[PDB]
Amino acid sequence: VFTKLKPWQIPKRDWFSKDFLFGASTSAYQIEGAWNEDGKGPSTWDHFCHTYPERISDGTNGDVAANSYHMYEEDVKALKDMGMKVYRFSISWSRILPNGTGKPNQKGIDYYNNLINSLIRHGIVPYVTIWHWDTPQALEDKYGGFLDKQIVNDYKYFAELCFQSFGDRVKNWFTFNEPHTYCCFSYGEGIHAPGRCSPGLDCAVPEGDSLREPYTAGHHILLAHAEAVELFKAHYNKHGDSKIGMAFDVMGYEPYQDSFLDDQARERSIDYNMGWFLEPVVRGDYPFSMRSLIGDRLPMFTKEEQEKLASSCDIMGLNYYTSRFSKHVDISSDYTPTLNTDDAYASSETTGSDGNEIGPITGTYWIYMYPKGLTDLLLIMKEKYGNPPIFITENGIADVEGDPEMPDPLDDWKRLDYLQRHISAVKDAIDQGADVRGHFTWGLIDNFEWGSGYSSRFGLVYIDKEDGNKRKLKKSAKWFAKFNSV
Amino acid sequence: VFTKLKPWQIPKRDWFSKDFLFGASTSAYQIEGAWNEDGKGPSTWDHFCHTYPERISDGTNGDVAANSYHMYEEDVKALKDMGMKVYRFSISWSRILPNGTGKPNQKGIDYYNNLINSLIRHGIVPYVTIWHWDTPQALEDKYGGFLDKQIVNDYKYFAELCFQSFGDRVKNWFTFNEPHTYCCFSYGEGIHAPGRCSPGLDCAVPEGDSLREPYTAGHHILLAHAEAVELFKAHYNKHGDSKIGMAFDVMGYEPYQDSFLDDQARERSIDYNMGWFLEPVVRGDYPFSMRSLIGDRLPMFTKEEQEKLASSCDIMGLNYYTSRFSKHVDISSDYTPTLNTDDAYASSETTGSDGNEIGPITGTYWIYMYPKGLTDLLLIMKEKYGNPPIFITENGIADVEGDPEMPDPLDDWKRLDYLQRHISAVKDAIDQGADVRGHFTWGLIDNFEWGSGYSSRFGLVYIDKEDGNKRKLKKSAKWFAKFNSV
Amino acid sequence: VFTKLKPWQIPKRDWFSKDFLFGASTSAYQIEGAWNEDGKGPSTWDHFCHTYPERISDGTNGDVAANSYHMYEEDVKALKDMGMKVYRFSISWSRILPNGTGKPNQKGIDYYNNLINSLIRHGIVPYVTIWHWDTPQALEDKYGGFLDKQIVNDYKYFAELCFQSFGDRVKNWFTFNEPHTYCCFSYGEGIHAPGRCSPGLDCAVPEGDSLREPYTAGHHILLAHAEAVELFKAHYNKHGDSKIGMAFDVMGYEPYQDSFLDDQARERSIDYNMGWFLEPVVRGDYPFSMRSLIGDRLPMFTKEEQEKLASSCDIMGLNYYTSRFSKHVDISSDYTPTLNTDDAYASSETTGSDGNEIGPITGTYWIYMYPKGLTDLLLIMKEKYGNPPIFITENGIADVEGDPEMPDPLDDWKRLDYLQRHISAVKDAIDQGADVRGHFTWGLIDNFEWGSGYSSRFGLVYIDKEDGNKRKLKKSAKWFAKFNSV
Amino acid sequence: VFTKLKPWQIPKRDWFSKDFLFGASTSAYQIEGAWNEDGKGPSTWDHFCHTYPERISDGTNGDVAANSYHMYEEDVKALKDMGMKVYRFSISWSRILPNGTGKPNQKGIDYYNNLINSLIRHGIVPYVTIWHWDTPQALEDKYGGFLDKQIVNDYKYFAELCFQSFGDRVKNWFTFNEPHTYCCFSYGEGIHAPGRCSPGLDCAVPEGDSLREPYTAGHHILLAHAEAVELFKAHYNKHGDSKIGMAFDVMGYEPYQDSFLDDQARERSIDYNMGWFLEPVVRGDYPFSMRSLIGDRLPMFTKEEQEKLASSCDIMGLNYYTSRFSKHVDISSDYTPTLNTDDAYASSETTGSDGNEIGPITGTYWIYMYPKGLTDLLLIMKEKYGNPPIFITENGIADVEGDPEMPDPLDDWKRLDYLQRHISAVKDAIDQGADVRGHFTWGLIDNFEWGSGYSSRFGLVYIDKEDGNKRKLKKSAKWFAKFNSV
Ligand SMILES: COc1ccc2c(c1)O[C@@H](O)C(=O)N2O
Ligand SMILES: COc1ccc2c(c1)O[C@@H](O)C(=O)N2O
Ligand SMILES: COc1ccc2c(c1)O[C@@H](O)C(=O)N2O
Ligand SMILES: COc1ccc2c(c1)O[C@@H](O)C(=O)N2O
Structure with missing residues (x-):
């Protein structure tokens, strides 16, 4: 049912303006493959799969993935075949700078230039995410990656290299992807690279602090962001036609029960899920x-850090x-927090x-269909945060391998109905004044x-593992x- | 202007229902006088004026006040002359039980019986506040009054004596008056008896803790309340026609500036001003x-204390x-709280x-006229807290002695306009569904x-100090x- | 504060459509200087300053002003440097026709052609006000200027010369600027050229009639307008791509107190301030x-005058x-009007x-910040008057010389906050359906x-009197x- | 149809509260008869019919009418048979004081006492209109009745005699009935006694001034009212359980066409129809x-007259x-007023x-059915004038003699549908907060x-002229x- x-x-398509943009997304680690070709250095996810393979459910890794390092022309084609106007993809920090820092890898730069030039050549606008959890394992080894201040400057240099290499063609950037998801899963539950969590919890490396590492890393991401955006606006936007922001993971929330207590809980959930990183780019503080x-x-942020973070997203x-x-x-x-997400005092x-x-299951166990949630969030953006330009930079569902109700992987009517419902929920928001400029389906x-x-x-496009990743x-x-x- | x-x-009067009640209020210490007659023991306010007289602006005290211990028949008459249906007054703990505990003082009981019988005799319903800051100095001396748990049981005994002495005629009770005002001023700034505050602050007795005493005392008041109400409902309401509650000091709040931050601030102000003591009687927790x-x-409250506090007001x-x-x-x-009221992180x-x-000044420096504030608060009561029966148990203004714009103390057109505006604001609330059962002007x-x-x-009624307190x-x-x- | x-x-800028226009304004007398060069005849303001210098607070006049007759290239540059798309400026009647009537002054025409050609050359669209209080003193001397019918035809000829000289490049015109301000101040209080008022009032020339001259002059302006617009639409808009209107001075109004009497007062204020000249261009009558x-x-208007005035603004x-x-x-x-503005029976x-x-002071004593007022007025335009195309052709504040709170004339954060608030109030109007096509800051x-x-x-741009008017x-x-x- | x-x-009946009152109305001249029995003096309507009989369409007069001077017991019975709780009737000034002034006529007093005592005896509450156009022709002859100031004091004396004679049983009074209808028809068009109008207009006595007499008479009615109410409240309401007001004729208005001009017209119509006499009893001025x-x-009113009129109706x-x-x-x-009703500059x-x-015709040519109009008026009362206690003291329709669509005078289904629709419109008002206390059908x-x-x-009750007025x-x-x- x-x-x-x-x-x-x-x-x-008439429902939206001529300038509204439809696209699809991917990230480096998730589709590239070629994890050690042409000089690329290893990333925290290379390392995490290679040393803790059992933390991947189906025993696989990203060594090859969709092989988009070699097959990118096919990705471009699939965009063109769907008629998408935008492609949101990420740059592999460790492919461009195998040691995180220092000497850039030409073969790495070339790769992106080729993808970028192919897009432009096919009338597709590139929206580039600079970092997508994809952190160079040299910097993890050197100083513990995002848990150390040094990541700030190092990220800055990486961002700069991206601006220098691609800024003449790429005019839209996201510094960071889903900092909340990253901090919670990578340093809290520890189910994601580098796999850290508090002693006594079950994760690859239970030598961290689930009550502090997520914040420390979050804090460094926001400082990194501020530095990069300041660098950008100052020396890499000479025509003024470039825009830079960040992408936030967000879930909708509804009060569990009708009571002023769950109303207050809902506000704490949205603060913790969304406001954790959005309020700092807005007002310069958590x-x-x-x-x-x-x-x-x-x-705590310094005065100057507040000022640099505030109004840092275009x-x-x-x-x-x-x-x-x-x-x-x-x-x-009776109660003490053990995971960072306990600090909200509101259980999801x-x-x-x-x-x-809350809504129908869509395949994977965590994605319940609730399009009203998106509309509500977009209206919070409008009413509370100044109605800044919003792109739905990810949205979609999963078909789970082996699900007997999804025997033909191409017959994804369920995904189609879901995407249609959310495209429609974005229209509802626009009709009510939300400033939503685009919709990118997650799952090119x-x-x-x-x-x-x-x-x-x-x-949206199947990848036939049995047929050469066609x-x-x-x-x-x-x-x-x-x-x-x- | x-x-x-x-x-x-x-x-x-047609604006309100036949059953709606208009009245006026007073408190023992403020009008009785006779501070040491017929056996009455001293209270914390006797003590505070007698040892720190300089903490009263005009150098006066309540030794005699309006002399209502002897002139109460005149008070009743003034109610009858205005046509009030209700009289809200308080019982002096130290007059009924000179030592806080132990042997009751008959002359004390007699006094109240006489006032009560006179009211009934004149068709006026008594609403009795059990404690109005009026705490027996024997208990202050013995264990530090409300700062010690022992106050809980002792209050309970006092309340019981009131129920036994007057419960056959008095059918409406308030356990405590303005716990927030009391805790803030008595233990925070220390401007009110017993006059305690943190070392280095300026108050009669800077030997307390402005960050802890207010909460300790608040906590004991709520436990006392719970015990008394449990005692009452169990053994002193055999006809079921008696109601018991508490009176809260409340200020309206408006966000200082249009921003989601002041919206959050306003919520913290109302929590701290009103919810501090109201949320516990509603849900059993702060x-x-x-x-x-x-x-x-x-x-922290115990499980049983939560359950006893929750739904404890009729x-x-x-x-x-x-x-x-x-x-x-x-x-x-940069910032650390020094007064309990700093803990709201919202400045008034x-x-x-x-x-x-916010509105026009009305005489004394802290009373700015803003009737919309009352209406808003009553609507919070309706919408958020279950719309329980609400009495405006105090409302009014002061004419300040010596103000050149108020040369004739009887020509209080300003007070009249204020009271009319608020009576009207209560009508607005009622029209919108607020369950407001009555309006008591503070200042009989x-x-x-x-x-x-x-x-x-x-x-409402002048007291001519030059003409024998007529x-x-x-x-x-x-x-x-x-x-x-x- | x-x-x-x-x-x-x-x-x-995203808040507004691509076609919405941002600009700045000035008027001839206020910035040109060169009051007697290249043949220019004297205006009523030349005359008023030269014969009644004491009626200017700081003892100055417009002989030289910003010297824009010579420095206009600098004005254009300042527009281009701010990125404005529109420049609203006025044509000096007495510079183009030194005697009001008769032989045109080529040097005068040339000047405007140069400004106009420079604007176009820099991508800036000229919106031209034909008359901005700037009336030729020859016509004042000849028949008393706007107090005589003859001004109607003479204005018409002036307007025609403007259309002939500049109509091939200038496609947007305002016949008259702030007729209400002009009539009230010039013929009522008499604080503005020609400085007339009733005998016994204090103004340069108390030989007028503060109860009649303002109306007589107002009436002649509207007849002039009607004639010019009829002339224009008939013989000077052969491509149909030209628009002609007028600019009204308007203040927002709020009822002084909550009462149906101040509600009626507010309506009379808006009628008198705005409707005095707007209702005639709308329905052809006051x-x-x-x-x-x-x-x-x-x-009274004649039938044909009604018909000519009605729908006369594009x-x-x-x-x-x-x-x-x-x-x-x-x-x-008890009461009789003495100034024309008394005829509204509503005091501001x-x-x-x-x-x-009503709102914060912004510098000069009459400008209190109240952006809601603008939004309300724009909504009256939408709902009551057919929602015709509206340009905010002036809006801004003054920094007063010598104000200790504005020591650095370039640090005009206060002006910036004000302009931002009003730009935002215009957005509010647009969001509610008001047809606002542009915003011109007064103060290029x-x-x-x-x-x-x-x-x-x-x-927006400082003029350094100590540094050669740079x-x-x-x-x-x-x-x-x-x-x-x- | x-x-x-x-x-x-x-x-x-459940639609309305227990205290809401249903009744019916009449006036002395219209039902009493006995125009010259038991000493009664002649009234302006006796005189008007007796000297200008041709001004009554069907050639009849009120000499005998329903003969209620003798048959009043039958009227009471008809009220009791319908179950009405209220009877609104008027006192004949000329029956109680044949000369307007001076010696009271006992037989006159007795008559009213009998009606009043019969009502009370049958559980029916009397609402008494003091004057219902019924003016003593002695005072018309002496000084021109309501056109002279002397009517003020004389009315006062009349009112006083009513209070003395009946005030112990009658607790609800209306000083005057429909002053607007009276002024317009009696002194403007002149179709009603005393029949005055401007020279050259067609009315019995075209020797008046249709532009001034209506106002003069209106002015005297309001002064009379003020005096009577002051007299009443001061010396004739010793229990405080008596209420005194006036009854206004009111028509609903809708703008003729959708335009802000007819919106302004509607406001002038309501002012002139209703506000002419209501605004003075509310704020003390027209x-x-x-x-x-x-x-x-x-x-013009004097200061003291303003103050006496303001808040003069209970x-x-x-x-x-x-x-x-x-x-x-x-x-x-082009236009000059000729009738007082022209001064509104809004034609009905x-x-x-x-x-x-506007709505269906109901019989007589001026009564078109439009119940929404009543609801609107009641909401103006609520919102604009303080929502004072409102009684619909007249409402109903006429069956016209000889109308072929109303052949059986008892089968008044049309009247019934009309009354039901308006009773329902009053319910709509009440549901929206209008303070309507009662509904009196005109036509007992x-x-x-x-x-x-x-x-x-x-x-509601037929009067069979062919069957002895049964x-x-x-x-x-x-x-x-x-x-x-x-
Ligand atoms: C609860 O498990 C997940 C919850 C959220 C995420 C996840 C896994 O991995 C990707 O699908 C992703 O983009 N986010 O945000
Ligand atoms: C700010 O000073 C005061 C503020 C509130 C109070 C006060 C003094 O004393 C009485 O008027 C009172 O009933 N409260 O609530
Ligand atoms: C009250 O003094 C003024 C009020 C309005 C104006 C004025 C002076 O001169 C200019 O600033 C102007 O454009 N108007 O409209
Ligand atoms: C237009 O003719 C009339 C208009 C209004 C009235 C009238 C006659 O006489 C009575 O029916 C009455 O009570 N009024 O109000």
Whole structure:
């Protein structure tokens, strides 16, 4: 039982302005492969899969992935075949600077130049994410990567090299992808590279501090961001036609039960999920709720850092998938936080007070369909944060390998209905004044879904592992081709 | 320049239901006098004036006040002359139990019985406040009064004696008056008996802790309340026609400037001003904001205490005078709280972001006229807290002695306009569904205004200190007489 | 205490459409200088300063002003440096036709052609005001200028010469600037050229009639307008791509106190301030309120004049600075009007019924910041008058010379905050359907502020009187340069 | 074609509160008869019919009418049979004081005492109108009745005699009935006693001034009212349980066409129809619109008169029948007022801009059914005038003698549908907060309809002229009997 839209409710490209942009996304580690070719240095995810292979559900890794290092022309083609106007992809820090720092790798620069030139050549605008969890293992080894201040300057240099190499053609940038997801999973639960967590928790390397490392790393990301954006605006935007921002992972929230306590809980959830990194780029400081609950575990900004962070995004990306119910947790003697996400004192529930799940399951266990959540978030952006330019830089679902209800990987009617419903939810927001400039489906092609390996397929375009990684358009992709009047 | 209502905007008694109740209020220490007659023991306010007389602005005290211990028949008459249906007064703990505990003083009981019987005899319903800051100095001396747990049981015994002595005629009770005002001024700034504050602050007795004593005392008041209400409901309400609650001091708040930060500040102000004691009688715990900011300085409740506090009021009193702008304060390394009221991280401003004061001054420096604030608070009560029965148990203004714009103490047109505006604001609330059952003007008669002595006159009825404390109806009183169709 | 916008509330150029136009304004007399060069005849303001110099606060005049007759290339440059798309300037009637009538002065025509050609050459669109109080003193001397019907035809000829000389390049015109301000100040209080007022009032030439001259002159302006627009539409708009209107001075109004009487007062204020000249260009007659109160002092239109005036504007300019409270005045035996503005029976107050000023002071004594007022006015335009195309043709503030809170004339953060707030108020209007096509800041450069001389600085661009009248960008100007992505 | 309510839309007595009052009305001249018995002096209407009989359409007069001077017991019975709780009737000034002034006529007092005692005896509350156009012809002859100041004191004495004679039983009074209708028809068009109008107009006595007499008489009525109410409140309301007001004739208005000009016209219509006499009892002065348009023809009030008039009604009666479209009239040289009602510069139209009549005709030519109009008026009362206690003191329709669509005078289904629709419109008002305390149908019994004689039948109860003036319940009356659960 998965009810689809009625045909008269399906979005049409006319619903959006001529300038509104439709696209799809990927990230380096997830599609490139070639993890050690042409000089590329290893990344924290190379290292994490190569030393803790058992932390990937289906026992796979990103050594080869979709082989987009060699097959990128096929990716471009799939965009052109769907009629997408934008391609959001990321640059592999360790491919461009095998040691994190120092001598740039020409073969690395060349690769991106080729992808970029192919896009332009096919009328596709590149939106480039600078860092997508893809951190050079040399810097992890040298000083513990994002847990050390030195990452700030090193990131800055990396960002600069990107601006120098590609800034004449690439005019839209995201410094960082999903800092909240990264901090929670990489340093809190430790299910993602470098795999750290508190002693006694179960993760590859339980030698960290699930109550402090996530904040330390978060803090360094925001300082890095501020430095890079300052560098950019000052010396790399001489025509003024370039925009730079960051992409935030966000979940919608609804109060678990009707009570002023869950209303307050919902606000703490959104602060912790979204405001953790968005409020600093807006006002130059973390949300009050977080400071009040986290105190000394949450680093203080200097005056100049506040000023540098505030108003540091020209554009903001929102990666939206699902929503949760926020259920209030009391502060008491009985309870002490053990994971960073406990500091919100609001637990994310998949079922609400009436016993019902928030929305239908879509395949992988964490993605419940709730398009209203996106609309609500976009309206918070409009009303609370100044209605800055918003791009849905990720949105989509997974078909899980082996699911008997998805036997033909190309017949992704479920993904199509989901994407249509959310495209429509973005229209609702726009109609109410939200300033949403674009929609990028996450899943250009099936790729390496971090801890789920390839067993989770997110693409519009199938990737046939049995047929040389060939790109094959799924039903959803074919719909975009009509939608975009190809 | 003080603009009055247009005559067609003045409330009429028809505006309210037949059952709605109009009355006036006083408290023992403020009007009784006779501080050491017929066996009465000394109270913390006797002691505070007698040992720190310089902490009263005009150098006066409550030894005699309005002499209502002897002149109570005159008070009753003034109520009857205005046509009030309700009289809200308080019982002097130290007059009924000179040692706080132990042997009751018959002359004390007799006094109240006489007032009560006179009221009933004149068709006036008594609403009795059990404790109004009026704490027996024997218990202050014995164990530090409200700073010790022992106050809980001792209060309970006091409350019980009241129920036994007067419960057959008195059917409406308030356990405590303005716990927030009391905790802030008595243990925080220390301007009110027993006059405690942190070392280095300026107050009679700077040997306390402005960051902890206010909470300790607040905590004991709520435990006392819970015990008394449990005792009451169990053994002193055999007809089920008696109601018991508490009266809260409340100020309205408006965000200082239009920003989501002052919106959050306003919520913290209301939590700290109102929710500090109201949320515990509602859900059995302090507001989340307070727990998050105050942590270990704010005592924890036991399970059974939660359950006993929750739903412990049948009726709630709101003492409303004025409003403020709430201005957000950041949590930072630079700032540390020194007074308990700093823990809200929201400063109360009298002027907003546009440079304007919130409303017109009414006489004494802290009462700015802002009736919209009351309406807003009543709507929070309706929407957030279950819309429980609300009585405006205090509301009014002061004429300041010596103010050249108030040369004739009987010509209180300003007070009348203020009261009319607020009676009207209560009507607005009722029209929107707020469950407001009554309005009690604070100021039956001019009385001892704590740290301002008599220099602040709050009464509807003047008290001529030069003419033997004679009761004389002011303009406002005369208006109530017409309003109530006397 | 002057609270600024939070950084996330600051307008961005994206807030408005691609076709929306940002610009700045000036007027001939206020910036040109060269009052007697190349044949220019004297104007009523030359005459007024030269014979009544003491009526200018700081003892200055417009003989030289910003010397824009010679330095216009610098003005164009300052527009280009801020990235403005529009320049609103006025043509000096007495420079083009030294005798008001008759032989045109080539050097005069050449000057404007040069300014116009420079603008076009720099991608800046000229919006030209034909008359800006700038009336030829030959016509004042000959028949009393706007107080005689003959001004109608003479204005017509002037307008025609402008259309012939510049109509091939200038496609947007305003016939008259602020007729209400002009009539009130020039013929009512008499503080502006020609300085007339009733006998016994204090003004340069108290030989007029403050109850009749303002209307007579107003009436002649509207007839002049009608004739010029008829001439234009008939013989000077052969491509149909030209638009012609007028610019109105307007203040926002709020009822002084909450009462249906001040509601009626507010309507009379807006009628008298705005509707005096706007209702005639809309329906061909003065507002009913004015006719009912002014009777025989307010000239009647002929049928054909009604028809010619009605629908005579393609575009309307609104010069907005501030707002007032409207306080009702009764009609009675006690009261008789003495100034034309008394005929509204509504006094403009700077403080409302609660004692507060309407908004913060911005420098010069009459400009209180109240952006909501503009939004309200634009919504009246939409809802009541057909939502015709509206340009904010003036808006801004003054820094007063010698104000100790504005020691550095370039650090005009206050002006910047004000302009940002109003740009934002225009966005609010647009979002609600108001048809606002553009925003012109008054103050391209500091200039001669009529009766305040240069002591009032309104410019985005400073004019250094000590440094040869050099143009220097202030903080606000620099912000527009970023805003316009220069 | 007259569409009736669906049966589920018919009001039920449950729709209104227990205290809401249903009743019916009459006036002395219209039902009493006995115009010269037991000493009664002649009234202006005796005189007007006896000297200008041709001004009554059907050639009849009120010499005998319904003979209620003798048959009043039958009127009481008809009220009791319908279950009405209230009876609104008027006292004949000339029956109680045959010379207007001086010696009271006992037989006159006795009559009213008997009616009053019968009502009370049958559980019916009397609401008494003191003057209902019924003016003693001795005072007309002596000084021209309401056109002379002397009427003020004389009315006062009359009112006093009523208070003395009946005030112990009658607790609700209306000083004057429909002053607007009276002034317009009696002194403007002159179709009603004393029949005055300007020379050259057609009315019995064209020796008056249709532009001044209506105002002079109106002015004297308001002064009379003020004096009487002051006398009453001071010396005739010793229990405070008596209420005194006036009844206003009111028509609903809708703008003729959608334009801000007809919006302004509608406001002038309501001012002139309703505000003419209501605004003075509210704020102590005529509406601003009227003063501005009427100037010197509209008498000025003294300070003390303002204060005495303001807030002079405890209750207000509204006599509602129908509505009109208000169509704007320009002030111009072409137009001059000739009738007082021209001074509104808004003509009352029966058909709107789309060509449709406002509502269905109900019998007599001026009563078009438009219940929405009443609801709107009641909401103006609530929102603009303080929401004072409102009684619909008249409401109903006429069956015209000889109308072929009303052959059986008892089968008044049309009246019943109309009354039901308006009872329902009053419910709508109440549901929206209007303070409407009662509904009195005009037409207890058919009576003398002034200039239409008996040919217009307004009663719930038929009066059989062919069967000795016997009272016979019509269909509508029978419905009230069920409605009131008799
Ligand atoms: C709960 O497991 C996940 C929750 C959120 C994420 C995840 C895994 O990995 C990718 O799908 C991703 O882009 N985010 O944001
Ligand atoms: C700021 O000074 C005061 C503020 C509030 C109070 C006060 C003094 O004393 C009494 O007027 C009172 O009932 N409260 O609530
Ligand atoms: C109250 O003094 C002024 C009020 C309005 C104006 C003025 C002076 O001169 C210029 O600033 C102007 O453009 N107007 O509209
Ligand atoms: C237009 O003719 C009339 C208009 C209004 C009235 C009238 C006659 O006589 C009675 O029906 C009455 O009570 N009024 O108000």
